[PDB]
Amino acid sequence: TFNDVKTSLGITESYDIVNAIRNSQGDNFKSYVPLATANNVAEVGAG
Amino acid sequence: TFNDVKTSLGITESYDIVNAIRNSQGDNFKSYVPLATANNVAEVGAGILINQTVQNDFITSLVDRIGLVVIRQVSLNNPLKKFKKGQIPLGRTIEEIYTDITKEKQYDAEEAEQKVFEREMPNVKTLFHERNRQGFYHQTIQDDSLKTAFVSWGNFESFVSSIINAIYNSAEVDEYEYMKLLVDNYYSKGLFTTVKIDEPTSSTGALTEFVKKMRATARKLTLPQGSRDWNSMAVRTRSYMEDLHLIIDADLEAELDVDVLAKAFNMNRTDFLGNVTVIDGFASTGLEAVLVDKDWFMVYDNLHKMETVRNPRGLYWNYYYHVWQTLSVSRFANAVAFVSGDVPAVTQVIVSPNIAAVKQGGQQQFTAYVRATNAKDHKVVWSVEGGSTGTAITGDGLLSVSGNEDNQLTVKATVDIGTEDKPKLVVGEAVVSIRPNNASGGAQA
Amino acid sequence: YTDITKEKQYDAEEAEQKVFEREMPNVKTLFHERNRQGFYHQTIQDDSLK
Amino acid sequence: DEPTSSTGALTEFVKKMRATARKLTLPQGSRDWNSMAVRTRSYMEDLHLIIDADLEAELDVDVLAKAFNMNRTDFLGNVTVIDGFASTGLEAVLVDKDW
Amino acid sequence: TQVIVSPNIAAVKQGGQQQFTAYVRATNAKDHKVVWSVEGGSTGTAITGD
Amino acid sequence: MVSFTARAKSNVMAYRLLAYSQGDDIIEISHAAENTIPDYVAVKDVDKGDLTQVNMYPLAAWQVIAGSDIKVGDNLTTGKDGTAVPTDDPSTVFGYAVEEAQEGQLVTLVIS
C-alpha cells in the first residue's frame, strides 16, 4: 500500500533523453524529431 | 504543363560520355564504338523526370503513347517485427511476474520436529507496462482526379493500394524508431549492464578485443545455470543462443567481419554472437553495440484500425490508420551494452526487494547489486531517508523498523564513486510500507 | 513510386475541427523511352552450301 | 582511394563494400544511396556487385573475409564479373536488380 | 557530387507556397551549406533561406 | 483579412519590400527606399501603371528577397530595390531573420 512514488526510482539518468531530443539540432537525435509521441514512450518505457 | 526542360534537369556531369565515345582512339571506350544506337541510350537512358511528349518517327502527327505503367511495390519492414509480442484488445496495463529461485536447506530429521510450517515466502518480482504510443497516419486519395492518369482499372486500383501500403510502410518505419528509442532510453536511464571497451575504430586489435568481449558475454548470457549479473532487476535468469540478438551499427559490423578473421567465416552462424540485427547508429553518444534478449522487448499491439471519411464536396477520401502500442522493455531478460570511451565506474545499484511490506518492529534483509564496469569492490552506504520515527538500517542492509513508525520510508544503497571533491553518489533505492502491529514494548534489555 | 509519410499524435481535441484535412501523397515518377532500334543480318546461300 | 595501391588498401575497399551492402538492405529503408532520394530498400538476393575481374580476384586472394565467402551470396551481392567500366576511377558498382 | 531537390516538380497557387528539400551527396563527411535560389522570367516569387 | 485597392507607381516586383504614398485619390505603391522601414510586401508583380490590392493582416513574418547574405537572427532593413539586408541601426530595423538566406534567396522575417 504505497503513497507518492516516482517512475524514476533506482534510475541514475546519465543524461535526460527528453531534454536531449528537445535540445536537438541535428546531433544524432534528429531521427526522433519527427517522432510523434516520443515523450510519453521515454517516460514509462523502462517498465 | 511545362516547357524548356531538357534531359539535363538537376544533372551535373563529370564528363560528357558522348564526346568520349566519339573521340575514342584506342581508348577504354573502344568497345562502345561498334554500338549502333549508342548516342540515343546516352541521352535518355538515365530516366526522364518531366515526360516530354514524343512524336512518332514514321507519322509525325501521331504521338507515341505511354505503354507499360510500372507501379513500384517496395516494402519497408521493421527489422524488429520479430521481437513484437501479441495483441491486447482490452485493458491498458501489462503485468510481468518473475518468480526467482530459493536456497537449499540440508535435510536434517531432527530439525524437522519443529520446522514444519516454516513460512518461506517466494521471491517474486513484478514489473508493469502501459500503453505508450498512440498515433495515426493520414493519406488523402482523390479518386476521381486520379482517373485521368490511369486508363485501366487494373493500374488504377493498383495505385490506390500503393497508397495504403505507404501507410503500412510508414508504420513500420516509426515502429522501428520507437523501438530504437527504447535502447536509447534504457541506456540513458542507466539500466544497461555496460561493458567498457576502447573505441573500436581506433585500431585493429582494439577491434579484436571487442569481439572477445562480445563472444565472452554471449556465452555468459546463455549459460544454462543463469546469473544475477546481466539484467537490471538482478534475478537469476538465462537466455538462449538462438534468442540472443546483437543490435549493432552497420559500419561497426562491417569492420568486424573483415578485420577480425574469426568472425568472418562465422557469418551465417546464429550462435557465434547470436542473431546480428544490423541497424544504423544509436543516438546515445557512446553506445557501440548491444546484446539483448528476445524477451527484452515487451512490445504489444493495441489498435490497428483504418477508419475512413469521404468529402463529397472535394470528391476525395481520408484514410486514417491508427496504431496504438505498448512500447516498453523488460527489466528482466538479460541485456548487455557495449560502451566505448568515458564511462562511470559504477552504473547502477540494484537493491533487492525494491518493494516491501514490513511490520512495525519487524525486519527485512536488503541486498545491493553494484554493477561496476571495472573490476573493483565498492562500498555500499545503506541509508533510510524518509520516515519520521527514528527507524535505522544496519551497515549490511538489514532494516529494523522502530515499532511505531506509521510513515512510508524508502531505503537507499549509496555507492559513492569519483573523488571526494565531486562525490558521484550512485544511489539505488527500495521502498518500504510500514504495517501496524499493535505491540507493546519501548525499551529492551 | 509512392514514398512514406509522417506520424501525427492521437489528439481527440484537435480532431474535432480537421477530419477533412488532406495529405497529398509523396508520389514521384520516372519515364523510360525506347532507346535501341537495331538489326543485323546474315545471308545463308544454302544451295551452294550443299 | 585506390585498391591496387597497397594490400592494406584492399582491406579498406572491402570494408566499404560490406558497410554499404548492409545499409542498402536495411528493412527500415533509407533516403540515401539513390538519386530520387526516396526511402527505398534492397534485399540481399537483390544486390549485385558489378566489378572488374582484375580487381575481383585481387580481393578473393588477399581479403580472407572474402576468401571463405567466395562461394556465397550474402557477404556482398551476386558478384557479376565484367571486363570493366570505361570511366576513369570507376571500380565497382553495387546496385539493385530493380536498377 | 549530386544535390537533390525535394519536390522537383511542383504546382503552386499564386497565393501559396511549397517546401523544397535539399539532399546532398557529399563524399567527405562534411555538412555543406545549401544556397536556395529561384529563377523565372516574371517578377517577385522568392525563396527563404531554408 | 482586410483588403483594399492600391495602384503601383513603379514596377512592383514580388517579394520586395514596399512603401506607399498618397496619389490621385488612391494609395500608390512602390519599392521601399533604401535604409528604412517598409509598410507592405509584394507577392505579385504589378507594373508601373497596374492597379492591384493589398491584403491587411498582422503577419507574423514576411518572405522577402535577401539583398545580401543573411545570418539567422540578423536585424534587417530595406536595401537596394526593396530587398532586405542586414544592419545594426535600430531606427531602420523592421524585423529580423529566423533563417539563413543567400543573396537572391527568400528570407523569412519576424516583424518588430
Swiss-Prot record, chain C:
Residue runs in coiled coils: 7-27
Subcellular compartments: Virion
Source superkingdom: Viruses
Similarity comment: family membership: Belongs to the phi29likevirus major capsid protein family.
Job of this protein: Assembles to form a prolate capsid shell of about 54 nm in length and 45 nm in width, with a T=3, Q=5 symmetry.
Assembly description: Homohexamer. Homopentamer. The prolate capsid is composed of pentamers and hexamers of the capsid protein.
Protein name (database record): Major capsid protein
Curated annotation (Swiss-Prot), chain E:
Subcellular location(s) of the protein: Virion
Domain BIG2 span(s) in chain numbering: 1-50
Highest rank taxon of the organism: Viruses
Complex and partners: Homohexamer. Homopentamer. The prolate capsid is composed of pentamers and hexamers of the capsid protein.
Function summary: Assembles to form a prolate capsid shell of about 54 nm in length and 45 nm in width, with a T=3, Q=5 symmetry.
Entry similarity comment: Belongs to the phi29likevirus major capsid protein family.
Protein's recorded name: Major capsid protein
Upper taxonomic lineage: Viruses, Duplodnaviria, Heunggongvirae, Uroviricota, Caudoviricetes
The gene coding this protein: 8
From Swiss-Prot, chain F:
UniProt record similarity statement: Belongs to the phi29likevirus major capsid fiber protein family.
Cell compartments where the protein resides: Virion
Native species: Bacillus phage phi29
Subunit-structure text: Homotrimer. Forms a super helix coiled coil in the homotrimer.
Superkingdom in the source lineage: Viruses
Complete-protein stretch covered: 2 to 113 of 280
Lineage: Viruses, Duplodnaviria, Heunggongvirae, Uroviricota, Caudoviricetes
Functional note: Protein that forms the 55 capsid fibers. These fibers are not always present and may have been lost in some lab strains. They may enhance the attachment of the virions onto the host cell wall.
Record-given protein name: Capsid fiber protein
